Scaffold this active site. Structure first.
Site, mmCIF file in Angstrom:
data_model
loop_
_atom_site.group_PDB
_atom_site.id
_atom_site.type_symbol
_atom_site.label_atom_id
_atom_site.label_comp_id
_atom_site.label_asym_id
_atom_site.label_seq_id
_atom_site.Cartn_x
_atom_site.Cartn_y
_atom_site.Cartn_z
ATOM 1 N N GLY A 1 3.859 -8.615 -5.818
ATOM 2 C CA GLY A 1 3.951 -9.030 -4.523
ATOM 3 C C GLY A 1 2.706 -8.984 -3.668
ATOM 4 O O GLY A 1 2.060 -8.221 -4.145
ATOM 5 N N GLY B 1 1.252 -8.844 0.690
ATOM 6 C CA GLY B 1 1.522 -9.194 2.030
ATOM 7 C C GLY B 1 0.006 -9.204 2.854
ATOM 8 O O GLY B 1 -0.847 -9.138 2.331
ATOM 9 N N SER C 1 -1.912 -6.335 -2.066
ATOM 10 C CA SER C 1 -1.289 -7.030 -2.988
ATOM 11 C C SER C 1 -0.698 -5.704 -3.867
ATOM 12 O O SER C 1 -1.409 -4.741 -3.925
ATOM 13 C CB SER C 1 -2.297 -8.018 -3.759
ATOM 14 O OG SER C 1 -3.174 -8.390 -3.029
ATOM 15 N N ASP D 1 7.053 1.439 4.013
ATOM 16 C CA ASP D 1 6.418 0.466 5.011
ATOM 17 C C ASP D 1 5.849 -0.655 4.090
ATOM 18 O O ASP D 1 4.762 -0.293 3.767
ATOM 19 C CB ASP D 1 6.204 0.855 6.139
ATOM 20 C CG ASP D 1 5.926 -0.039 7.446
ATOM 21 O OD1 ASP D 1 6.530 -1.282 6.922
ATOM 22 O OD2 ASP D 1 5.743 0.292 8.592
HETATM 23 BR BR1 LIG Z 1 7.237 6.899 8.257
HETATM 24 C C1 LIG Z 1 6.422 5.787 7.154
HETATM 25 C C2 LIG Z 1 6.694 6.080 5.734
HETATM 26 C C3 LIG Z 1 5.576 5.097 4.973
HETATM 27 C C4 LIG Z 1 4.640 4.287 5.320
HETATM 28 C C5 LIG Z 1 3.813 3.223 4.170
HETATM 29 C C6 LIG Z 1 2.813 2.973 4.539
HETATM 30 N N1 LIG Z 1 2.367 2.235 3.388
HETATM 31 C C7 LIG Z 1 3.674 2.496 2.414
HETATM 32 C C8 LIG Z 1 3.578 1.753 1.426
HETATM 33 C C9 LIG Z 1 2.369 2.266 0.212
HETATM 34 C C10 LIG Z 1 2.490 1.575 -0.878
HETATM 35 C C11 LIG Z 1 1.643 2.279 -1.906
HETATM 36 C C12 LIG Z 1 1.592 1.438 -3.435
HETATM 37 C C13 LIG Z 1 2.621 0.513 -3.594
HETATM 38 C C14 LIG Z 1 3.295 -0.265 -2.495
HETATM 39 C C15 LIG Z 1 3.135 0.581 -1.068
HETATM 40 C C16 LIG Z 1 3.855 0.001 -0.028
HETATM 41 N N2 LIG Z 1 3.282 0.360 1.265
HETATM 42 N N3 LIG Z 1 4.483 3.201 3.173
HETATM 43 C C17 LIG Z 1 4.761 4.113 6.784
HETATM 44 C C18 LIG Z 1 5.505 5.051 7.481
#
Ligand SMILES: Brc1ccc(-c2c[nH]c([C@@H]3Cc4ccccc4CN3)n2)cc1
Ligand SMILES: Fc1ccc(-c2c[nH]nc2-c2ccnc(F)c2)cc1
Ligand SMILES: Fc1ccc(-c2c[nH]nc2-c2ccnc(F)c2)cc1
Length: 332
Positions: A27, A29, A33, A160
């Site tokens: 996916g 966003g 990616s 997130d």
């Molecule tokens: Br409280 C709080 C907890 C988590 C987050 C957050 C930021 N970025 C992300 C993940 C990182 C990531 C790494 C690898 C593959 C996909 C993803 C999807 N976004 N989580 C923000 C606030």
């Protein structure tokens, strides 16, 4: 430095260490990616996110730094953890890409009406992770089923990814109150928990006005005590000009749910945010009697978010981000 290899997946180029094999897109966003991969070093399936245009503007650069700082801090079973962060860059001068790696999770809660035993365990985990997050003075602000990763074992992690967000948003945020608190996240968990129990979105508002309308239909229009806290003349004029409505009896709304799940919903979805149950208090509620262990619900190290107040140049945000990539220590 690892040996990197390059490929193109869905019009995006991926340059990753050879440690990570069999990349397949899952996916994409606004801010990245994501690929699933096999981590040859650990034998784990992982998710790899390539940030999109991480240093394009001051705004982007600060967002990149924010995400990396946050992810580097999170060290809890019910919050996403960073397994690795890397860049193909060999120096600061050539640094223009950031990749993040985490454990690959089966699915999310939006994919997943559940049994009460399943609701207990899923909400317990969300609150356990929230006790941790909140103890660091962090507010998630966008809790919703698609931000909850769940494996086949029902183990859950908050993340997130950055279904309308507004459906899970606290009423004070609809009203644009500048001084909302961490219980905005408790509001979201109440909305999620309701949806898991019923199989229906609790407050499927079409816009912010409709969202507030649906909320107040359940929780009542503000009482006198809450009205005294509202500084805005126009908001007070608006709220007070509404046909007034009593708080509904939740026992009737959530017909046939575990009475303890009803009681917890009442405590999470109180209109006045000052009166909502905290994450730590919620863990001790009788609904979680089979899971609660006060000696296994840890708090977080303090988290310095002073950088949020700083106005720096793109290259300064970039260099700070590079410092954090370099200093990263993988978990045991
Ligand atoms: Br409280 C709080 C907890 C988590 C987050 C957050 C930021 N970025 C992300 C993940 C990182 C990531 C790494 C690898 C593959 C996909 C993803 C999807 N976004 N989580 C923000 C606030
Ligand atoms: F102990 C090992 C060694 C290599 C592998 C492996 C399997 N497929 N591809 C690789 C590979 C390719 C390039 N670099 C790597 F580190 C791994 C798995 C476990
Ligand atoms: F229609 C309403 C009225 C008040 C709220 C509300 C809930 N908790 N806190 C507030 C609040 C506190 C101070 N100032 C504000 F603007 C809002 C939410 C919707």
């Amino acid at each position: 430095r690892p040996t990197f290899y390059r490929q193109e997946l869905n019009k995006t180029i991926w340059e990753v260490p050879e440690r990570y094999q069999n990349l397949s897109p899952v996916g994409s966003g606004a801010y990245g990616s994501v690929c699933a991969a096999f981590d040859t070093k650990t034998g784990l399936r992982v998710a790899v996110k390539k940030l999109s245009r991480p240093f394009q503007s001051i705004i982007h650069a600060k967002r990149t730094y924010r995400e990396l700082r946050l992810l580097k801090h999170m060290k809890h079973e019910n919050v996403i953890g960073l397994l690795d962060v890397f860049t193909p860059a060999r120096s600061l001068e050539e640094f223009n890409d950031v990749y993040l790696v985490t454990h690959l999770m089966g699915a999310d809660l939006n994919n997943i009406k559940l049994t009460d035993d399943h609701v207990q365990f899923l909400i317990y985990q969300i609150l356990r992770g929230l006790k941790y997050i909140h103890s660091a003075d962090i507010i998630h602000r966008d809790l919703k089923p698609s931000n909850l990763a769940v494996n086949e074992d029902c183990e859950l992690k908050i993340l997130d990814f950055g279904v309308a967000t507004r459906w899970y948003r606290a009423p004070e945020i609809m009203l644009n109150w500048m001084h909302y608190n961490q219980t905005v996240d408790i509001w979201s968990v109440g909305c999620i928990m309701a949806e898991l129990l019923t199989g229906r979105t609790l407050f499927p508002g079409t816009d912010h006005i409709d969202q507030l309308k649906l909320i107040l239909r359940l929780v009542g229009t503000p009482g006198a005590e809450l009205l005294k806290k509202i500084s805005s003349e126009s908001a007070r004029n608006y709220i007070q000009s509404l046909t007034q409505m009593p708080k509904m009896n939740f026992a009737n709304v959530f017909i046939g749910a575990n009475p303890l799940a009803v009681d917890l919903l009442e405590k999470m979805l109180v209109l006045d945010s000052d009166k909502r149950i905290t994450a730590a208090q919620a863990l001790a509620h009788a609904y979680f009697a089979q899971y609660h262990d006060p000696d296994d619900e840890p708090v977080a190290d303090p988290y310095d978010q002073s950088f949020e107040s700083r106005d720096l140049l793109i290259d300064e945000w970039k260099s700070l981000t590079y410092d954090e990539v370099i200093s990263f220590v993988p978990p045991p």
